[model samples]
Target: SLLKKIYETRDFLTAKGVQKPEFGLILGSGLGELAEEIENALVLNYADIPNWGKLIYGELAGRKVLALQRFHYYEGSMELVTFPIRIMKALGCQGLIVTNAAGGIGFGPGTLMAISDHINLTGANPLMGNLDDFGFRFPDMSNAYTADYREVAHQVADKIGIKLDEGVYIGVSGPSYETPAEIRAFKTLGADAVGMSTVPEVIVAVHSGLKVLGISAITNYAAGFVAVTQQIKEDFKGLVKAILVEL
Candidate 1:
């Protein structure tokens, strides 16, 4: 049973002195060093946890924080990709802040975009199999990426003087980059950013009653949008640092 597994893992972490985490932050490929920037940090590797980690626990801008290393669907199934969110819920997290490095449809590289909504073109969902004691069997994603948090994100960006754009992210299953034609079609579908992660985790987070706020580090222009560029690298790191100042 998945519910049993959730409880067992929760008990393990709790017994290990990981208390109620008010927020969980999922970090993508880049921004590795930023996890330790928080105060009173405790780091745990995945080999020690039941299913995940490089688990980080600390205080960030007055938030009880859990900074998790994100797992993508390209590496495994949606279940594996979303397990951290389950643990966040089990640990009593009230909100989730998930970040990803993505190819922008039109936005320039090295900028940050708040995910206003998501399109799960990945064709897989964490909720597909298990009927657990989580929030909803059929979760409504109407405002999945909580509006209040998004508004706050904007305010934080303004306060910090870092430009944060807002966009709809299209999530796909990818070990490969998108084709030019595919990118065009996705643009037609109203996608402002394309990525291989984040959506599944948000779905699971919302299902577990966690308010979510997603941000994308625009690493490059998506295929067909423009010529190839480069990684978001530091802009995302600094932007995340700024967001933490308010969250």
Candidate 2:
């Protein structure tokens, strides 16, 4: 279905002068408008794009649906929905960036984390159940998050006079927020932050040979119900603005 959808939009990109977008971004929750920074926005409806009706499921405005939204696994097939990373590659997108509003499992907000790496704690693989359509079975995730890109993002943050925090992100499957016990488990397992979206997209992006950059704007504390502390802080807006800077 996604293959048909990509073919359908192939000419549209050419006609719109979007030849292999230099940077492909999968905007996470509460961060859709970042796509507006693109000089000339070529908009498309997710419903209009085949296979995408359920991809990134949510009721977001169509202003630039080219920006994927509300991606989740409950749609029954993650590879089906997260399939666009491969499409973005086929379309000539070279670099992929994943952004999300996560809870501070390690450091608090305003940290502007660089996502040094991630743990696919989802215990599920999007690559499962489909092989022929994508690539080889058991695609290597050794370098799921590109190291060079991480360095660049940090350097970019430094130049902007902001400290780009580094942390290990854990991917979970949920439309529901994580419970305190889940957060505690994640912290103990070495994750500094957690969210539901980025890992699948990152896997596909790497498999497609695109460089990856990831940032997390912490929206809340790590479900601080266990040890309620008055000292914990959470504010993520500043970091969101930092990514807009040129690296």
Candidate 3:
């Protein structure tokens, strides 16, 4: 219902604009302030939008429904989960910049890394649908995270004096942190950063024909603290390198 409403309303916006949006940004935790940089942005609240539903998180100002806002993988409904990326596609956005506050499974805390690639540690996907509204039934993830974009992000970070690292982001169905065993498995699976958001939206974004750029801000180390045991640590903090390795 909210989805359809969001769809129609975006259509109206696109028709009014002289040119469709060519670039978009999804603000993660510690990144919402970036939206202010967008010149003359037309803010839209999620609750007021057509297909968009309720905003559950207090930190989430859905006012930027058309721009960027706080989004969570743990609490958001599936449809709402991938809304921004999909909506961008609907409105003719070509490139998407997605950022998130995540914990580094590799270098530790205060680490700000660019997402060179990602893993669906959430073990679930928003693309599980019969509808072809955005893409084909089978979407090619070979370049789910764009390479040129990563290079440019690192370059930008360098310009801004921010050391940017690149790593694999694993999206989990969170609200509950992972166990030590799970952390080890993620490492074995090639995950360098762990978080509760971004991955799904990336999936839909890529599927919907948008070139993507992603980044993660490491909050802490995962369970077992890099030990090979099956322990779990919910407290994330600690030295950090924001490596920018391409996936």
Candidate 4:
């Protein structure tokens, strides 16, 4: 079953010198550059592991880090989207930092926001079926995004003189961007940013007993909030880089 698959993947990573990864960072789109910051990096493509994206094992700010090249929901099923998180847990990751390029709803473009909570608008969950041992059948998401990690994130940004916005991230299943009406509804639901990733990974991370920290790089304004897409991909890249340098 799924548990056995996780164990087998764990053994494979250990044999590859991954050792014990204390933290796993899931990079989305342009944010993959954070993986390049690792010292003594050992790279493994997802083909080498059991699931999605490339995995980089190394040191980042003196911590044993496992960084992913990219993660998303539109790529496949919710199970496939969150499979890497289970692998991270099986490999002994205690904390998870998930970053994404998102559309700012109320906030302006190029804002870097810490996900205070999440609204899973995708109507899907990775923990929906069997609860064979990964976690409790009904996991508590009261503190899905760990508060302590959020504090550190804020402190780090303050120390670096960078502005970090805070908000609830609304996740949607999308190969397509949201419409203006949908964006309006999401804002009314109290989401500061909207994206197609991060939520599922965070949910699975919490179930696996990992402290979670979600960071979003606002690359543009969401539909209805503004007119069109503003290209802030470089801005998103730099903000994530700043956070990684200090974390």
Candidate 5:
């Protein structure tokens, strides 16, 4: 049923003149500004896209792409969280760039970190108990975050004069912020930052044969490290601009 739905959505998009999308972007909280940079854009409401969220289909850096206005795991299962990526593959997307507003474990606010690896504490994956045309049963994550894309991101950040940090991102099933003790535990687990989204989608994207680039905007230090608000929002337009330039 899910596979049939993806093909139908693909047919719908192709009929609307979006035959193929080369790259896909999942914009997180406070990061929707990135979608505004797409020229000649065609806005598609999630309600109309079957299994996807609000999406903008258009050109970015001379390439046809799709930019999602939002993403979340708290609102759905891993399957629902990653459904858009599967559709992206069906629509001919080869690469994916996922971004999020995250709590810094060691970095300062406003820092943009290129995720090198991830620890999925969400305890779920989109590929659980399944076999489909999407990918093989066992997808290798030895290089989950695409190395070439990370290198290109670094070069782009340097060229654009943005301070880009590189680290591992940990994903949790969260509608609640982590406590100080939890933050300490995460730091000890080798995670440089933590957020509620990203991992599930990345896993699915890799499984579908898409090269992935994960970026996190360190909005604030994790709970117990400071006395600030639990949710600190970071404007990610700068990082988005850098990635656009790289592409």
Candidate 6:
């Protein structure tokens, strides 16, 4: 059923000339100059793709890439939230790169944390449905964020002289910020960064057999974890562009 819709969406996209993307890059919001980086892009509004409300298709760093933005669980169902990923898989993308701006724990602001694992505190799972078409009915998340992909990112970051830290990410259902108490709980639970997205996307990516690499732009410190901060700067674009070339 879900796979049927995924195939329909894939057919619609390919009929419209979207190539078989090798990688999918998901951003929480906005495309800006990134769309420009895509060579000979066949950009389209998500209105053209069934069940998707927004998206951009193109090639980046010589790899066919799909850049997604402007959809969230807060605005839709988990199935809807991850449907584009399903389309990416159906379109032939085997890799996923998901990024978000998160409240850093002790890690502080102005940096990137490669998500090693995740704690889904959102009280939901996309696989809580009839999605056994790809992986298993109960997909193993033991390696949700691909280890070799993280190693690849590390190697790329090193050559580019980027500081790449790594830690667990905790996802919360929110259009709200985490409380000091909640933040403390997350910190104690071994979360290095907290965000409202990524977990579901990663879950679906892993289930779809897509190797995922999560990158968090530590935009600020979670409550009580720090008494200070910086102006917040990053080479997020550089890191991603470099990693894409290597991947």
TM-scores vs. true structure, each candidate: 0.92, 0.80, 0.77, 0.90, 0.91, 0.92
Score each candidate by Cα lDDT.
0.82, 0.65, 0.64, 0.80, 0.82, 0.81
- Give the alpha carbon lDDT tens digit for every residue of 95-184 in model 5: 999988889996877677889999999878778874565458889998989999999888877877767899999999898999899889
lDDT (tens digit, per residue) of candidate 3 on 5-34: 556867755554414555566666655554
lDDT per residue as tens, model 6, 1-247: 7877877888888888887788988874322345567887887877766756346787788888988754678875898788877888889998999888788895877768899999999889877867554547778899989999999999998999988899999998887889999999998899999888889888989888999999887867987765122223336777888999979
Residue 45's lDDT within candidate 6 is 79
List candidate 5 stretches off by more than 4 Å.
Answer: 133-135, 226-235
Residue ranges of candidate 2 with Cα displaced over 4 Å: 1-5, 12-17, 53-69, 133-135, 225-247
Q: Candidate 6 at 97: error in angstroms?
A: 0.6
RMSD of each: 2.6, 5.8, 7.7, 2.9, 3.0, 2.7
Per-residue accuracy of model 4 over 1-247 as CA lDDT, tens digit each: 7777777878888899989898888887667776787899999987767534678999887678888885566776877777788888888888888988888896876677889999999878888885666448778999999998788878877876767789999999887999999998889899899888988898888888888989888767898764222334454445555555555
What TM-score number comes out for model 4?
A: 0.90
Model 2 per-residue lDDT tens digits across residues 2-78 = 56666766655556544545556676666665454444555665665544522222112221123454557755667
Comparing 3 with 6 on TM-score, the higher-scoring candidate is 6
For all candidates, the clash counts are: 0, 1, 14, 0, 0, 0
- Candidate 4 residue runs with Cα over 4 Å from true position: 226-247
TM-score of decoy 5: 0.91
Q: Give the TM-score of candidate 2.
A: 0.80
Error of 5 at 159 (Å): 2.0
For candidate 1, write residues 96-147 as lDDT tens digits: 9998888989586776899999999998877897665554688899999999
